[PDB]
Write a protein that binds this DNA or RNA. Structure first.
Length: 183
DNA sequence: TAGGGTTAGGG
């Protein structure tokens, strides 16, 4: 079976009325749910406005994501690939972004290399192999922009990515300022 | 709209 983390989706912006039951009832329309829950406050027991649904397979998760937008209990919710508690620590881990930072690429890396690995995740909009705007020297990293934020999410939850024959690190792209605020 | 008594011992 596939890892639990990869079979689970975070569901944000849940209506105040949504319960484990109403959530399950909606998302079961795209597969077998092995888990479904609405996070509530320990004391007040009130909904925190978000939850999680987990399918028996990633194929079902993908089906659910392909079924966006999702309206549950009259409120449009925001389903996202569940990010592990560990990665949830990294800055910007939960941002809705369409661009990824690809670091550790061989100097001879060309765009076709990036396409050959990343296209399988979604429509690529822009590819930028970074160089020093002065010496023209390759800096060893690129930026790839997709059409759907879920492409980025499907990618960053994986651990390894092979580009131009060798593994590379892929994170969500932070802005010039976000980088600063994280340093 | 980021997790449910779910994260470093004791030899």
């Amino acid at each position: 079976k596939e890892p639990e983390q990869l079979r689970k989706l975070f569901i944000g912006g849940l209506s105040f009325e949504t319960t484990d039951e109403s959530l399950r009832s909606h998302f079961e329309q795209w597969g077998t749910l092995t888990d479904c829950v609405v996070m509530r406050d320990p004391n007040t027991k009130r909904s925190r406005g978000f939850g999680f649904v987990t399918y028996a397979t990633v194929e079902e998760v993908d089906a659910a994501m392909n079924a966006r937008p999702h309206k549950v209990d009259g409120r449009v919710v925001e389903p996202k690939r569940a990010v592990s508690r560990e990665d949830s620590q990294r800055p910007g881990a939960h941002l809705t972004v369409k661009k990824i930072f690809v670091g550790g690429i061989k100097e001879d890396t060309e765009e076709h290399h990036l396409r050959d690995y990343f296209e399988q995740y979604g429509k690529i909009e822009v590819i930028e192999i970074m160089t020093d705007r002065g010496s023209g020297k390759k800096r060893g990293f690129a930026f790839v922009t997709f059409d759907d934020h879920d492409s980025v999410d499907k990618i960053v939850i994986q651990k390894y990515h092979t580009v131009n024959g060798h593994n590379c690190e892929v994170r969500k792209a932070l802005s010039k300022q976000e980088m600063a605020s994280a340093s």
